[PDB]
């Protein structure tokens, strides 16, 4: 899998790109602990209407791994510097878990970037660590993430993102060359970094409040926004369950939501072809209603 990459920011950005360079861009975001390799079988369904990028964050996939914090702050500052260098100034985006948090703030504070947002299984601020996830299992795992020192034993030893949390939210069984590429940039203990921080980010009773902060701002600018809106759901979900979408989507103008049926929270791997098909005539009729 040869990506194309660019030096940002003193390290080094990898991204896949395809369709046709003439077509309104599309940013494709992935979260926790994936890559643009999420996006595999979904970008050629798309590539026919829009000129497609799906990087790899900073510190994921082939991107770069700089010593730096790995805090949502370095996630976005990478982000932007990868965008600007590859003068992204209009662009549709396709955003799941971090991807979306990175999506909502990048729109609060360029709010003339994104001509739509396609997202499933979003971050929200929680106000408790009851509105995180859909089982107490989960909840349990993620409130140990947060614990020092037990975290890191699960993380940086165990390297449980990867090799628990990410198959345990998949409903088909990955084949052994999938799951090869997804532990493949966490082989070493101190590249499982970035997939520690994430969890620790998560704004859960205010904290971090800083992350708080910019995804209360960021969602209510979401909620004040008019670009066209599409979300994803599955059956029963992990972050969004089907009532919490329909009830999300009241909150916005201009957001429809597509039922995926039976799903965790890495929907594209269990329905490539429905997101991509509908990613795909959705930018299709914006294009057409926009151009009059
Ligand atoms: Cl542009
Ligand atoms: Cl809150
Ligand atoms: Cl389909």
Redesign the pocket.
Known sequence: ISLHHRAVLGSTMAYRETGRSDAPHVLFLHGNPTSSYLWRNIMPLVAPVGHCIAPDLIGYGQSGKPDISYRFFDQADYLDALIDELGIASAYLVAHDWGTALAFHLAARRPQLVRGLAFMEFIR???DWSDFHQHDAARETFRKFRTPGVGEAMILDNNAFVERVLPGSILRTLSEEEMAAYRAPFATRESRMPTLMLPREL????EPADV?QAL?AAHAALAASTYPKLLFVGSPGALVSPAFAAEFAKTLKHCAVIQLGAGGHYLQEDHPEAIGRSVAGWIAGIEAASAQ
């Open positions: 601020p929680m106000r704004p859960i009773a205010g708080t209360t």
